[PDB]
Amino acid sequence: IFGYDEEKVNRIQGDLQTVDISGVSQILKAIADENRAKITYALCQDEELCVCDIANILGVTIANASHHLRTLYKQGVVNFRKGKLALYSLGGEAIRQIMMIALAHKK
Amino acid sequence: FGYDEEKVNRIQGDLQTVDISGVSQILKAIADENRAKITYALCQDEELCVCDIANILGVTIANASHHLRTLYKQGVVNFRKEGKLALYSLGGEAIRQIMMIALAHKKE
Ligand code: NA
Ligand code: NA
Ligand code: NA
Ligand code: NA
């Protein structure tokens, strides 16, 4: 080879082709946002919140809050379930891990 | 009065004791696709150099060095120099787990 550690590079490139690295940047980008991360975190502490709790927790308009929640929802960071009113919860125990490990690391 | 004030207030109080800001900085570091690739590739080998990394990404050495600088300022990678070989490894097991849990959650 006229190259550089080609065997290793080939094999790690083959590993990368096995996983959805595009999809992980999407999910981490959803969570990383300042207000989104505040949301995810609140949902770690209480099971369900409505959008107005979230507007008021963050100190943002409801339109701001719905936007953030939609973003979260599409990536599976959050669940919902609609009397007239949407209740929101963590999209899975995975998401509690992500935040709580993240938390623990920066310590 | 206003809306759900004491519950809002409670929760604002949790949030204030926690470094949400720093978490958001870490995930932002990891979340860019090329950096997310460098991150994942360091979950596979204990150590890699800037050259393995450019070659795995198919990028210039300069362009790998800049994403690695960005990863390293956030704690996401460490290195040990070798004499002009800079050898990166993950910044901690926590970084393996965020990536791996996010990948497996995306599988569902
Ligand atoms: Na408010
Ligand atoms: Na946005
Ligand atoms: Na960069
Ligand atoms: Na660690």
UniProtKB/Swiss-Prot annotation, chain B:
Domain of life: Bacteria
DNA-binding region residue numbers: 50-69
Keywords: Cadmium, Cadmium resistance, DNA-binding, Metal-binding, Plasmid, Transcription, Transcription regulation, Zinc
Subunit structure: Homodimer.
Pfam families associated with the record: HTH_5 (PF01022)
InterPro entries: ArsR-like_HTH (IPR011991), ArsR_HTH (IPR018334), HTH_ArsR_DNA-bd_dom (IPR001845), Metal_resp_trans_reg (IPR051011), WH-like_DNA-bd_sf (IPR036388), WH_DNA-bd_sf (IPR036390)
Organism of derivation: Staphylococcus aureus
GO biological process terms on file: response to cadmium ion
Positions bound to Zn(2+): 92, 94, 105, 108
Domain HTH arsR-type: from-to ranges: 15-108
GO terms of molecular function: DNA binding; DNA-binding transcription factor activity; metal ion binding
Result when mutating residue 49 to S: Abolishes dissociation from DNA
Gene from which this protein is expressed: cadC
Gene3D superfamilies linked: Winged helix-like DNA-binding domain superfamily/Winged helix DNA-binding domain (1.10.10.10)
Purpose: Metal-binding repressor for the cad operon. Involved in resistance to heavy metals, such as cadmium, bismuth, zinc or lead. Binds 2 metal ions per subunit. Metal binding to the N-terminal regulatory site causes the repressor to dissociate from the DNA.
Extra remark: The N-terminal, regulatory metal binding site 1 has higher affinity for cadmium than for zinc. The second metal binding site has higher affinity for zinc and has no regulatory function.
Protein name: Cadmium resistance transcriptional regulatory protein CadC
Annotated positions binding Cd(2+): 2, 49, 51
CDD domains listed in its UniProt record: HTH_ARSR (cd00090)
